[PDB]
Design a protein around this ligand. Structure first.
Ligand SMILES: Cc1cc2nc3c(=O)[nH]c(=O)nc-3n(C[C@H](O)[C@H](O)[C@H](O)COP(=O)(O)O)c2cc1C
Ligand SMILES: CCCCCCCCO[C@@H]1O[C@H](CO)[C@@H](O)[C@H](O)[C@H]1O
Ligand SMILES: CC(=O)c1ccc(O)cc1
Length: 365
C-alpha cells in the first residue's frame, strides 16, 4: 500500500523525503545554440520535486559525447549556469538532484557531434539502432547510427578527464551529486558488455579488462567530488541499444561488487528500456543486493504495488518511475492516494517547448 515507499532515506550527507526517484529522462528541450538547460526545464523539474531524488536527463560531458538533438550539455560556462537555474528551482522546492553525466559512445550520428565519427570500445556499429538529429525543423529526425572508431589510449584518458571535469561542473551548477550513465548501451556499457567489446588490449578480453574503463572513470569521479556524491547506472539485461553481454549475471554481479569497493552512494539498475523488459530473476536481484550494499535503486515498469513489494522484499531501497513522472508532476501524491495516473504523449517526449513538458496538471478530482 506504499508505506515503505513513503519512508525517508539517507543518501550520503542528504536525507531524502521518500523512496521515489524521478529517473533520468532525455526531453531534448535544451536552448539553441549551445545546448543550454533553461527556464522551462527548471519549471519541469521543480514541478516534480516531491520526488525523493531527481536524476537529471543525460547531459553530455563534451561535444562528441552527445547522441541526440537538443540535449543539454554540462561542459561550457553557460551550460553550467543553465543547470544552476534548474538546481536552484528544485532546491527551492526541497528535493535532491543529481546530474546524469553522459557519453553515448557509438550511439550517435555525425550530425550531433560536429561531423565527427563516433567513438566506442571497438569499431562495432550498434545494430538496428537509431537516434535523432536536427534537420532544419522543430521535429526530431530519426537516423541510423554511424560506425564508430575504436578508442585509443589517448581517447580513454581524454574521456576520463571529461567525466572528471563534468563532475566538478555539476557541483558548480549546484547539483547534489552525479550519476554516471554506464547503462542503456552507451559508451561505458560498450566496454562492459562482451559482445560490444572486441578490444585486444587491457580494456577488453577478460571480465577484469571489460570493467576497467568503468573502474577508472568511477575512480576519477570519486576523486573529484567524493564517493557520497557519486551514483552509477547499469543495465545488466536490457539490450535495446545494441549491447549484449554473454554472462550478465557474472559481469554485473562483479560490476556491483567493484562499485561497492568504490563506495559509490547508490547503484541504479535500469530494468526496462522502453519495451525491452527482460525477465530479471529475483535471485539475481538478491545477489546484487549483497554485491552492492549502498542505496540500491531500480526503475522499469514499476507501479505502486511492485515498488512497495521490491522494497519490502529487501531488493531495493528506492524505485524510479519514468514515464509516469512525465505525465504526473505530482506522481508521489497520486501513488500514495491511489489517484488515477495520466498517461504521457509520445509525440511530445522530445523537442518542442512547454507543451507536453510543463503542462501536465496536478491531480484534481
Ligand atoms: C523520454 C525518455 C527519455 C529517457 N532518457 C533517459 C536518460 O537520458 N538516461 C537514462 O539513463 N535513461 C533514460 N530513460 C530511461 C528511464 O530513466 C527509465 O529507466 C525507463 O523509462 C523505464 O522506467 P519506466 O517504465 O518507469 O518509464 C528514458 C525514458 C524516457 C521514457
Ligand atoms: C517566485 C516566483 C518565481 C517565478 C519565476 C518564473 C520564471 C519564468 O521564466 C520564464 O519561463 C518561461 C517558460 O516557462 C520562458 O519562456 C521565459 O523566457 C522565462 O523568463
Ligand atoms: C533519447 C532516449 O530515448 C534515451 C533512452 C535511454 C537512455 O539511457 C538515454 C536516452
Amino acid at each position: 500500500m506504499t508505506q515503505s515507499l513513503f519512508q525517508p532515506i539517507t543518501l550520503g550527507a542528504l536525507t531524502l523525503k521518500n523512496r521515489i526517484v524521478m529517473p533520468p529522462m532525455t526531453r531534448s528541450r535544451a536552448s539553441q545554440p549551445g545546448d543550454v538547460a533553461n527556464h522551462m526545464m527548471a519549471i519541469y523539474y521543480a514541478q516534480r520535486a516531491s520526488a525523493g531524488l531527481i536524476v537529471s536527463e543525460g547531459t553530455q560531458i563534451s561535444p562528441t559525447a552527445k547522441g541526440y538533438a537538443w540535449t543539454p550539455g554540462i561542459y561550457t560556462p553557460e551550460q553550467i549556469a543553465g543547470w544552476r537555474i534548474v538546481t536552484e528551482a528544485v532546491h527551492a522546492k526541497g528535493c535532491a538532484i543529481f546530474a546524469q553525466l553522459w557519453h553515448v559512445g557509438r550511439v550517435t550520428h555525425p550530425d550531433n557531434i560536429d561531423g565527427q565519427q563516433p567513438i566506442s570500445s571497438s569499431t562495432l556499429k550498434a545494430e538496428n539502432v537509431k537516434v535523432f538529429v536536427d534537420n532544419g525543423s522543430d521535429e526530431p529526425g530519426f537516423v541510423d547510427v554511424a560506425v564508430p572508431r575504436a578508442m585509443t589510449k589517448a581517447d580513454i584518458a581524454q574521456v576520463i578527464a571529461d567525466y572528471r571535469q563534468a563532475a566538478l561542473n555539476a557541483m558548480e551548477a549546484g547539483f547534489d551529486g552525479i550519476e554516471l550513465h554506464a547503462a542503456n548501451g552507451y559508451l561505458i556499457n560498450q566496454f562492459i558488455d562482451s559482445e560490444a567489446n572486441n578490444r585486444s588490449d587491457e580494456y577488453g578480453g577478460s571480465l577484469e579488462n571489460r570493467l576497467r574503463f568503468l573502474d577508472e572513470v568511477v575512480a576519477a569521479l570519486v576523486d573529484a567530488i567524493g564517493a557520497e556524491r557519486v551514483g552509477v547506472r547499469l543495465a545488466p539485461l536490457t539490450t535495446l541499444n545494441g549491447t549484449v553481454d554473454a554472462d550478465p549475471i557474472l559481469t554485473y554481479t562483479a560490476a556491483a561488487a567493484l562499485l561497492n569497493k568504490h563506495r559509490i552512494v547508490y547503484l541504479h539498475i535500469a530494468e526496462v528500456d522502453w519495451d525491452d523488459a527482460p525477465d530479471t530473476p529475483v535471485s539475481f536481484k538478491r545477489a546484487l543486493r549483497e554485491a552492492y550494499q549502498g542505496v540500491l535503486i531500480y526503475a522499469g515498469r514499476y507501479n505502486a504495488e511492485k515498488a512497495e513489494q521490491a522494497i519490502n522484499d529487501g531488493l531495493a531501497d528506492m524505485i524510479g518511475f519514468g514515464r509516469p513522472f512525465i505525465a504526473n508532476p505530482d506522481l508521489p501524491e497520486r501513488l500514495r492516494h491511489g489517484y488515477p495516473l495520466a498517461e504521457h504523449v509520445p509525440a511530445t517526449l522530445f523537442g518542442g517547448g512547454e507543451k507536453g513538458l510543463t503542462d501536465y496538471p496536478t491531480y484534481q478530482a
